[model samples]
Target: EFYHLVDDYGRGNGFFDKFNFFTGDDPTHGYVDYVSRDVAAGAGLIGERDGRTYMGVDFTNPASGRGRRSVRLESKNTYEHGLIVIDLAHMPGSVCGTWPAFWTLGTGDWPYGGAIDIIEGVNDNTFNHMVLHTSDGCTIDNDGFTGNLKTSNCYVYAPGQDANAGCGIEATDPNSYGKGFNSIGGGIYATEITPNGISIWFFPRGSEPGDVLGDNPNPANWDTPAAKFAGGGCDWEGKFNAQRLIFDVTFCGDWAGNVWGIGGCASRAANCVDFVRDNPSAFAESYWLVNSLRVYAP
Candidate 1:
């Protein structure tokens, strides 16, 4: 008894529709959606509509010139037992060619059938990231983890703390985190990958988790500043395994086309292509509003 999803413009549906089931044989050049008619105008097909349960991917589709899009969900087993909870609390933050992600993969072939980027970032906004792309023992936990936990007045250290050491200080305040955190209120992100490991959490409605690690109850103290700002999670059980979960908003390619050398597709001056395009409507008009998505099993 856990079904209620929407988004085919029906408004009610939280989110649905994941095609291609974990990209493999990946081939495409421009405007990539993989299939399902490029995701019938911003995919959405949640519960009720006949047993369906969840699939909601918007990721600000400005039409692929760059506002990146990749949706894939269909995991029947590769290492069963699951739980994917997404409330999002109406997401939309830090615009600038926005790039959002809540990831997982493994359904046919990919990095040896594996990829888990449980919540990602591009264009900082304080900080909230968890990544693990296998191929060599997987590692995370340099001491619990926490980055700009949306702010309780932020502070979570341990792992050679020196204010967590350089390479981060908002990295480069680009309009205050890739679009300034969707203009504010890009909250609610929870990912739980099990086998007694893998845990990613972000909540900013009222805020909890000891109000962003005051006493720092563990996540390894911030997993060595998330492996020195996004790198590894410290072998979280031999390089993760069998996953499939993705939500996107990509543009400017490879980290905003190489750190703010932005161009256009959704209208970055029609097509400038370089010179650090500087805030092109931060994703051409903020979008990442999700409300609900829950996947759990034991």
Candidate 2:
């Protein structure tokens, strides 16, 4: 119980300089146009929509050779071990060629300070996936978790794991992500990161715990997390530290584009880029309606 308030991102209040707007090309080589904070403010890339917080991609622009417009938000404050909670009313749809993520990255060089993907998915996935990216010599034990383990090794470049695949866990519920998540009135994702391990839990709308809804949140009373990354002789503190939260939605990115036709989405589109370029209306539902983001510091 030694935690204090780090930040409280409430609806209609804006980010209050707590986050830096990303204005650059997609790092993962996605077909997107990351706008500046000024541009986003002018073009309606982020703000309130229908009384809720709105953050998402451009759904009104006509066909063009240039990639679609979007925004990537990164937090300015950094922390290693904190409880991060996000309450949402809606998220982008499970549309073809779409890739969305709510993740964190450390200040140091890639994979050294580590990265955490709390909510991530590509294309038409209905289940959110979580993963931990780190340098070599770390892995996750198969215990004290609820999600289906997709990879055991935490090393992004491990020999047996796919190149830069990292260690991953997939949520078991269909309504835990994408379209299904929004249909049921999007829920909350609470992640507890500690020196010992990292655990993530999800509450679909009404089911969130009393401690969570109240100011004094406690992870001890919650159910078994949706996923937990620990054991396997991993050094949690050595790998992850000084993390900044990031939120983004891109079209036909590395993962979604690379496995375009092969990822059970061939029937939906011929090639990811072309399909995304043509179906502008299909992405009308591709927006984020966030209520709050509460962080607790150690």
Best of the candidates, lDDT: 2
lDDT of 1 by residue, 1-298 (tens): 2222211222233233332344332221222343342353335412332332333334343443332344334433344335455545333354444455556665554444445555556443335445444443333333344443221111123234333111221222222222443444444444555554555555544453442322213333322222222234333444456565565444444454444444333344333233113333343333444544555544
Model 2: per-residue lDDT, tens digit, 1-298?
7456778876654662667888788888888888887787677778876768788888877546448888888988887789999988988878888898899998888979899998888888989898999998889988888899999888988888777788999999888899999899999999889999999998888888877745668888899889999994898889898899998998887788988889777887779888888787778777788878889976
TM-score of each: 0.27, 0.95
The alpha-carbon deviation from the true structure for residue 95 of candidate 1, after best TM-score superposition, in angstroms, is: 3.1
**Which residue segments of model 2 deviate by more than 4 Å?**
63-66
lDDT by candidate, in order shown: 0.40, 0.84
**lDDT, candidate 1, residue 213?**
20
Worst 10 residues of 1 by lDDT: 149-158
Which residue pairs show collisions in model 2?
A: none
State the weakest 10-residue window (summed lDDT) of model 2: 9-18
Q: Which predicted model would earn the best TM-score?
A: 2
